[PDB]
Amino acid sequence: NLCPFHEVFNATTFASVYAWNRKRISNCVADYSVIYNFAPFFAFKCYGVSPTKLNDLCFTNVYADSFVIRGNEVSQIAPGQTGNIADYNYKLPDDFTGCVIAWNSNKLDSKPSGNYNYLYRFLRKSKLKPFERDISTEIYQAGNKPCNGVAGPNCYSPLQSYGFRPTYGVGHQPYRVVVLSFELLHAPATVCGP
Amino acid sequence: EVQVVESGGGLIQPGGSLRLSCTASELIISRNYMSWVRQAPGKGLEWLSVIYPGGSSFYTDSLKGRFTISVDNSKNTLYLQMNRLGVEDTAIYYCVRDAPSESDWGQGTLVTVSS
Amino acid sequence: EIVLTQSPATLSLFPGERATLSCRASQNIGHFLTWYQQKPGQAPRLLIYDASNRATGVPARFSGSGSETEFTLTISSLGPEDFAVYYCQERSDWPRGTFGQGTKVEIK
């Protein structure tokens, strides 16, 4: 049974970056050339691994981390980067091993009058740990006074909506991003390229 | 209005260094987006630097390598270390908290780089 | 680098007149643009965020419009306090961004 990569890439709807959905791939022969053959996946940045050699290595599990972000914030998705998404939504470790695959999705994700179904976290006490998810929608405290978990001055909802519109610039159009996160821990692997 | 007060601005010789200070009464500086913006006399505003709640900070290319931004969690202050100040740096430097629905500026402190 | 050309340099309206302030961007930045009010000798004050949304405490007379490369601040009626400088700042990397040269609201 072949692996579901193309199901992840062509999923009809992607998850919000703050609640970044994770799909786990295991016990399958993962052909990476075929996804690399789909050049319309414009961004193919890879770190801590050789993208070509993925077809030769084995891994215990591969996580298909899928979400949507603005085009300009795509730069924040990389090792050692900082900013809105890299801190409060999806922090990649500075020693990250894997690949990020991002492509413009304005043709489908963007809607007239904005697409607000995609949301991102921007307020938090500290940086997210690598691969940390935080769905907590509680009112974030930004001052001395506790504000009873109800929105008001100096205490805000930590999530904001992108509102993607079709006509925005390339740097601000939605970019569907799927991030391959790898695993190998003291046991025989399950996923192998060859 | 939430009040933030700047301090530490004054006369300085060319080529010197300076540290501006900014304090917050109501809000917590460590838990907010804080930026420094200067307004040279009779000239437009120029955003200098920002520090995020998580400690991430950014600078303009015109100021990279000269200005540095830092915070104090216990005292609840924001600091801007300035190095190699020229005459053109003469400006009122503001401390501002930026939020999607709010922007709380202080009242600025003058920096005079002159002989 | 994104450069914003505010116009007119000076907007000499009589009090109570509607004030329209143009701010044009050299790049398509979407609606990520912010407008700041600034009384003389005082720190700026946020009016509009994302070019359309009025900030808290700002009177309803203020309103924003335009997108992408042509943005316009609209004051339905200039009050005496409204006679001040106004800056447009892009927010492509919020809260970062460059400012416009500003527009002065004074008649004589």
Numbering used by the authors:
A (entry chain A): 334 to 527
B (entry chain H): 1 to 115
C (entry chain L): 1 to 108
Paper text:
We now describe the isolation and characterization of a human monoclonal antibody, 19-77, with a broad but incomplete SARS-CoV-2 neutralization profile. Structural analysis revealed that 19-77 recognized the spike RBD in the “up” position, and its epitope overlapped with the ACE2 footprint. Structural analyses and mutational scanning led to the construction of engineered antibody variants, 19-77Δ, with a single amino acid substitution at residue R71 in the framework region 3 of the heavy chain. These modifications resulted in greater flexibility of the complementarity-determining regions (CDRs) of the heavy chain while binding to the viral spike, thereby enabling three 19-77Δ variants to neutralize all SARS-CoV-2 strains tested with much improved potency and breadth, including against the JN.1 sublineages.
To further explore the mechanism of the enhancement of virus neutralization by mutating R71, we determined two additional cryo-EM structures: the Fabs of 19-77ΔV and S309 in complex with HK.3 or JD.1.1 RBD at 2.9 and 3.1 Å resolution, respectively. We then compared these structures by aligning their RBDs with that of the 19-77-D614G complex and measuring the alpha carbon (Cα) distances for each heavy chain residue in 19-77 against the D614G complex. The analysis showed that the Cα distances in 19-77ΔV, when bound to HK.3 and JD.1.1 RBDs, were significantly greater (0.99 and 0.91 Å, respectively) compared to the original 19-77 in complex with HK. Moreover, the motion of the CDRH1 and CDRH2 were observed directly across these structures, and the valine substitution at residue 71 resulted in the loss the hydrogen bonds that had existed between R71 and the residues S30 and P53 in the heavy chain. In addition, the CDRH3 in 19-77ΔV exhibited a shift of 1 Å compared to the original 19-77, resulting in an increased distance (from 3.3 to 3.6 Å) between residues P100 and F455. This change mitigated the slight van der Waals clash between these two residues in HK. Lastly, the distance between V475 in the JD.1.1 RBD and N32 of the heavy chain of 19-77ΔV increased to 3.2 Å from the 2.0 Å found in the original 19-77 bound to D614G RBD, showing the mitigation of steric hindrance caused by the A475V mutation. Collectively, these findings support the notion that 19-77Δ mAbs are indeed more flexible and therefore more accommodating for the mutations found in emerging SARS-CoV-2 variants.
